[PDB]
Amino acid sequence: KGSEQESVKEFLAKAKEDFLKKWENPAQNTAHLDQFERIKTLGTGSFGRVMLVKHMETGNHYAMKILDKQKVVKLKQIEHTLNEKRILQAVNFPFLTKLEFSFKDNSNLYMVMEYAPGGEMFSHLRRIGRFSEPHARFYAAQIVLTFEYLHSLDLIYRDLKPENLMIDQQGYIKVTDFGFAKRVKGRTWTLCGTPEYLAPEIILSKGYNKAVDWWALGVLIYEMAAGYPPFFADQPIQIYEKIVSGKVRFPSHFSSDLKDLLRNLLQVDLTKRFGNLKNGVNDIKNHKWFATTDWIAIYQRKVEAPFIPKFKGPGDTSNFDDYEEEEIRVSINEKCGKEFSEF
């Protein structure tokens, strides 16, 4: 289509048509583990890990998330895991990695996605210390666009943080980690996310909506620009007490416009929180701090990234930490058939 052919509204309307087709009729069982060569573990977690793999028939590199069915069950993440796969196989956006393949075997669930060789934003943010406002703004813009997309599909994302933002070969980002994402038109109630990034209404055990994502954006922008988050302590409980008060202090190097944006994102009052008002996302996109961002150019990936990863070949993993490599064991007996029937 032409670059000015459609409004954002029209573009998002057509994107929803595309999404709903796939949402209503999900792809299932589209590869097998023996089609991939396992190269390296890129991350680990409580019920899963992510590996760099090579698809043998194409030589393409992918990230493959491997979930142990029994562990997903023990941790009560069955419905959340079904959500993740159903959503990721249906989405399509420049800053998301949709599923290229998914499948399961007796023991595990597998989701295969475009590989992001730049590593986690977390790694770079901690090492460098903090990002300049233009640098933080460039990342933030991509999240604003991605949330507008996600939210227009009635999706809530619910785990924004630097650990869950992957940097690609051109220095743009991928919003990964859809484990808590959910398609919901009403309010919802699950206590989930990461302590530092939780909106007060989640902590106060209120029903909540997509406004929690916009609060989390405020937390991210603060952390990217300051080098530490707005609410931290050694223990989660102390972090929660800080959030519910919502008292924040800005570094003296923060610009006036940054502070003002953050005051409107980190707003405890839902009737005042940017992203949650009559005008929706446009209150964010039209804020003075974003006055210089070319939303159209960012979407088209036309803007030169402020930081472009070191890249020494298509399956390079130098931007990742090293993790202990564990076997992928497949039982001879089918585990959790019923629970993951639709996967």
């Binding site: 993440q77 943080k161 484990g179 989930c192 990461t194 530092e196 931290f232 202090r249 570094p251």
Partner: peptide, 20 residues
Amino acid sequence: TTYADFIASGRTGRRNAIHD
């Protein structure tokens, strides 16, 4: 400094999600 207090904290590494 706030930076120093952060770096001395136990939450500068990768943060785990929470779950009810």
